[PDB]
């Protein structure tokens, strides 16, 4: 006979989704400004419209995105295997090979055939083809149903190849589908730990070890993945907040009036430009107000040097005496304007050069001739019991501001310095007033030493630990807690900082007002080095670095505020416990997932409907009754639904019980397939308006066997409401198979086919010694055996035929002796086929592929290369019949045992 | 496309035999039906084999079925026409044509002809 599938068909393997991921440069000389680059591509293998997308980047055009360009691939005669994405193993499912038929006006005869794989459980085994002749009218289609099992885990091929009959053409399909284990994917959380390294571990570090995956549900030999995930926890070091400009905008005034009149409306405005600037509220505040408040520090600065007196100092009036106080704070405040606005430095420097010829004394000490007409700008220096002091260490304060400005111009300034720095040592820890240790607490942290005494003499004086308060008006307390903060600056402490900033905010002195010269120009010039200096955040710096037993090297990652990896995922496929290393400052939080198969309910198959189909030979040459009754298991009725029925191989539907189907009132069958030919129709779908939840609906139809075959394929039933394809439900219907089920063997989730044959089929007349020899003398052929059947357990899934080992003419991997006995199992297919006889002989070998359980309990399974051959009894060969055999089996047993298999 | 050149043919004796050697210009791979045709004088244009894409399926007209045999090589782009037992009645121009693979014993689905060769089979 003529096999068509001999056209050495090469199947199409080539459904890449995409493709073409090229890079090429038109270097072609171009002609009107146009270079065209002919490029030759091969075409892959799917038959489909590729949408071709180009675009370019030019150095003197830009981008320019190309209108898609689109090829049409297609052949007249083609296969479509409409293969699933995937198919959990061991369930039998039914694939459509969907032939197509383009020409015009001539009906194909095609044969078809499904390859055999090992991996799949189908009717095409080692020595037995699936193919069929089927018929394709012209523009038509035809879903050629294939029923399979898969048998093992992972990528899988299915290959269908055609022919046609009476023209050379040919067509083969090679797609793959994944074999996902009966399981159903399913996620854990393996551990949540929180990092942070200077609260838990020792030393500066945390040391985390993380436990593997916990998993009690996971299907056995299974793959799993594990998720590191490293990530930083952000938290807004904590800052205190600055002081709303809508609050300060009262200090812009214009300065007016004598020498110290005018510094009395210069303060507010440069102490407020000066804290804006820093803060940069301008945006919130008025971006056009800045220039007109710079245009009043000029003004401030303009009329201050009418009342400059030539001896570079500084009075009320220009007959005024000059003042150690005045002098000394109008450097405090040009100092701190220079920033902003400059004009001339030697009227600063100017300043300084006087301040210690004239008022220091080499103890040290700034006293003040008190010409200050203006008691208000005072400040907290006014009503001072210890005024000698505080006085000291207001004019040391100055001279740092302008220090360096004034290095070169005032050489001896850093010997007054050192001087006024010798004077407050000696009298600190002698002082009572909270205000004199707090002005003489910056003024000795600036650029200076304070004694271990020192600074517990200051810091155990904030009442409250918190706020400088002494008996007086509470200018003075602001005003003193606004130096305390600018030590705790000068001297990069932080841990008493939060709670004094606190105070300063909570006191809600937004400057302004009468007396408030020293108190404006204080609390927002601190306030201002708060927000020049500080640790908006909490400085996250972890350097995380696990170290995982699962390879040879430590993967780290330094998580900074930096927003660049925030989190980094680490997936480590091993399932094996590791550890994390966490060092550093700020907090962060590690997640450890893995994903697995859980095994659970297969129960997922046919959980929105019931369905009930079955198979009878009610009474050309063979009519059977297809009945299929169906229910939805919802609270109500299920919306328009589909039967997608497939008929078994060689059986076609009855056209006049479709008709009267089509005619019922809650059914439709299309007109495409009424008028159908009574062959090729093995597919049929009958559409239901609705399908009850109280009731099972039930249809029937009579099917015919229009074509004799050797091996029908069970065929399948399918329900699906319209809106949903995944909640389907397939039962398989096929006189003289178990619920539509392929015979397969399946012991703890591991399934071997069983649609082969019985056994090796050679008679026992057309073998000879020589052939026995041959090939039991193979490698494959693992063990060779004299049996004697003891008892046949027959069962309903395969027949059980315990064997006694009569001889052991070849031992095999298992270690089996003498009286021992062994389990030979066969589906009871074979039962009629191997005619089996207790207390009989049998001469059996087999390959190692066929052992079944474990070495303590190992059964043999009677496949395809199996060897079963009757051995009569020593009486029974002085019979001329079986004189042939029982010389061969004699000679093949001392040829065997005692000589052995030569290669 | 795809041109084709015969030769092999002349002038032979009436019982002998020759064979003739179609040149393809591309590569003949992929081409499903590859034919040969000939027209004697004063009579049509009539088939007389094909070849599978592989070689392993043929068709011959009845009137040279057991006496001629068609072969390709494809890794060659060739084609030939081994003729035996020859007859005066196989006097005819023998023309190599491309085809599509169906209905691979008309000419309706062969698009890319040759010159064609004369063979003279005298009486």
């Known amino acids: 006979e003529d096999i068509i599938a001999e056209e050495n068909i090469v199947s199409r393997s080539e459904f890449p989704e995409s493709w073409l991921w090229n890079v090429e440069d038109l270097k072609e000389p171009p002609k009107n400004g146009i270079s065209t680059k002919l490029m030759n591509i091969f075409l892959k293998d799917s038959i489909t419209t590729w949408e071709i997308l180009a675009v370019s980047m030019s150095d003197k055009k830009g981008i320019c995105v190309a209108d898609p360009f689109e090829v049409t691939v297609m052949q007249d005669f083609f296969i479509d295997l409409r293969l699933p994405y995937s198919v959990v193993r061991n369930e039998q499912v039914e694939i459509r090979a969907v032939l197509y038929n383009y020409r015009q006006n001539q009906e194909l005869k095609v044969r078809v055939e499904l390859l055999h794989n090992p991996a799949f459980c189908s009717l095409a085994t080692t020595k037995r083809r699936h193919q069929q002749t089927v018929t394709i009218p012209p523009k038509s289609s035809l879903s050629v149903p294939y029923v399979i099992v898969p048998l093992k885990t992972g990528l899988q091929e299915v290959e269908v190849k055609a022919a046609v009959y009476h023209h050379f053409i040919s067509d083969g399909v090679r797609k793959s589908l994944k074999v996902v284990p009966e399981g159903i994917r399913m996620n854990k959380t393996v551990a949540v730990r929180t990092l942070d390294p200077e609260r838990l571990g020792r030393e500066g570090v945390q040391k985390e070890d993380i436990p593997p995956a916990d998993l009690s549900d996971q299907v056995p030999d299974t793959e799993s993945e594990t998720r590191i995930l490293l990530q930083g926890t952000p938290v807004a070091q904590m800052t205190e907040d600055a002081v709303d400009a809508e609050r300060l905008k009262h200090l812009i005034v214009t300065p007016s009036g004598c020498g110290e009149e005018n510094m009395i409306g210069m303060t507010p405005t440069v102490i407020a430009v000066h804290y804006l600037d820093e803060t940069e509220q301008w945006e919130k505040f008025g971006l056009e107000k800045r220039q007109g408040a710079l245009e009043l520090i000029k003004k401030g600065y303009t009329q201050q040097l009418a009342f400059r007196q030539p001896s570079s100092a500084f009075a009320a009036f220009v007959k005024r005496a000059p003042s150690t106080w005045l002098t000394a704070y109008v450097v405090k405040v040009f100092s701190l304007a220079v920033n902003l606005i400059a004009i001339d430095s030697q009227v600063l420097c100017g300043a300084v050069k006087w301040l210690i010829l004239e008022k220091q004394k080499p103890d040290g000490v700034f006293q003040e001739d008190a010409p200050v007409i203006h008691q208000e700008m005072i400040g907290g220096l006014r009503n001072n019991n210890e005024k000698d002091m505080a006085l000291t260490a207001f004019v040391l304060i100055s001279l740092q501001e302008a220090k360096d400005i004034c290095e070169e111009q005032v050489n001896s300034l850093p010997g007054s310095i050192t001087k006024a720095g010798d004077f407050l040592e000696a009298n600190y820890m002698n002082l009572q007033r909270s205000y004199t240790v707090a002005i003489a607490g910056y003024a000795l942290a600036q650029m200076g030493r304070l004694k271990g005494p020192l600074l517990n003499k200051f810091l155990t004086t904030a009442k409250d630990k918190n706020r400088w308060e002494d008996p007086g008006k509470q200018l003075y307390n602001v005003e003193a807690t606004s130096y305390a903060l600018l030590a705790l600056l000068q001297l990069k402490d932080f841990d008493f900082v939060p709670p004094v900033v606190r105070w300063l905010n909570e006191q809600r002195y937004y400057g302004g007002g009468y007396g408030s010269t020293q108190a404006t120009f204080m609390v927002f010039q601190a306030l201002a080095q708060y927000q020049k200096d500080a640790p908006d955040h909490q400085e996250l710096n972890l350097d995380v670095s696990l170290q995982l037993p699962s390879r040879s090297s430590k993967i780290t990652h330094r998580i900074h505020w930096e927003s660049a990896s925030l989190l980094r995922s680490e997936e480590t496929k091993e399932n094996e416990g590791f550890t994390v290393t966490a060092e550093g400052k700020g907090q962060g939080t590690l997640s450890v997932v893995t994903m697995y198969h859980a095994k659970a309910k297969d129960q997922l198959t046919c959980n929105k409907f019931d369905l009930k189909v079955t198979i009878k030979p009610a009474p050309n040459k063979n009519t059977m009754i297809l009945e299929i009754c169906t229910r939805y298991r919802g609270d109500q009725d299920a919306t328009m639904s589909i039967l997608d029925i497939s008929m078994m191989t060689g059986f076609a539907p009855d056209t006049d019980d479709l008709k009267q189907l089509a005619n019922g009132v809650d059914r439709y069958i299309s007109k495409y397939e009424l008028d159908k030919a009574f062959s090729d129709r093995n597919t049929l779908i009958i559409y239901l308006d609705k399908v009850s939840h109280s009731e099972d609906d039930c249809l029937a139809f009579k099917v015919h066997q229009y074509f004799n075959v050797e091996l029908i394929q069970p065929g399948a039933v399918k329900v699906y409401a319209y809106y949903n394809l995944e909640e389907s439900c397939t039962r398989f219907y096929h006189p003289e198979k178990e619920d539509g089920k392929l015979n397969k063997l399946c012991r703890d989730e591991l399934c071997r086919c069983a649609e082969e044959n019985c056994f090796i089929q050679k008679s026992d007349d057309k073998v000879t010694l020589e052939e026995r020899l041959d090939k039991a003398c193979e490698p494959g052929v693992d063990y060779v055996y004299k049996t004697r059947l003891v008892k046949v357990q027959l069962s309903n899934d395969f027949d059980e035929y315990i064997m006694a080992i009569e001889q052991t003419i070849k031992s095999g991997s298992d270690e089996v002796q003498v009286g021992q006995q062994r389990t030979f199992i066969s589906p009871i297919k074979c039962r009629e086929a191997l005619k089996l006889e207790e207390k009989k002989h049998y001469l059996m070998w087999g390959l190692s592929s066929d052992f079944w359980g474990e070495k303590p309990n190992l059964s043999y399974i009677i496949g395809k290369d199996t060897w079963v051959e009757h051995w009569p009894e020593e009486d029974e060969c002085q019979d001329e019949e079986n004189q042939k055999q029982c010389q061969d089996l004699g000679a093949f047993t001392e040829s065997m045992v005692v000589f052995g298999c030569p290669n | 496309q795809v041109q084709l050149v015969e030769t092999g043919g002349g002038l032979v004796q009436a019982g002998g035999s020759l064979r003739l050697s179609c040149a393809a210009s591309?590569?003949?791979?992929?081409?499903?039906?590859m034919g040969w045709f000939r027209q004697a004088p004063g009579k049509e244009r009539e088939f007389v084999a094909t070849?599978?894409?592989?070689?392993?399926?043929?068709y011959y007209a009845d009137s040279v079925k057991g006496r001629f045999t068609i072969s390709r090589d494809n890794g060659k782009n060739m084609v030939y026409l081994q003729m035996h037992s020859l007859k005066p009645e196989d006097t005819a121009i023998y023309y190599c044509?491309?085809?599509?693979?169906?209905?691979?014993?008309?000419?309706?689905?062969?698009?890319?002809w040759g010159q064609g060769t004369q063979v003279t089979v005298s009486s």
């Open positions: 044509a491309a085809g599509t693979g169906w209905s691979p014993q008309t000419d309706n689905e062969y698009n890319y």
């Open positions: 591309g590569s003949i791979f992929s081409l499903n039906a």
């Open positions: 070849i599978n894409r592989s070689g392993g399926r043929t």
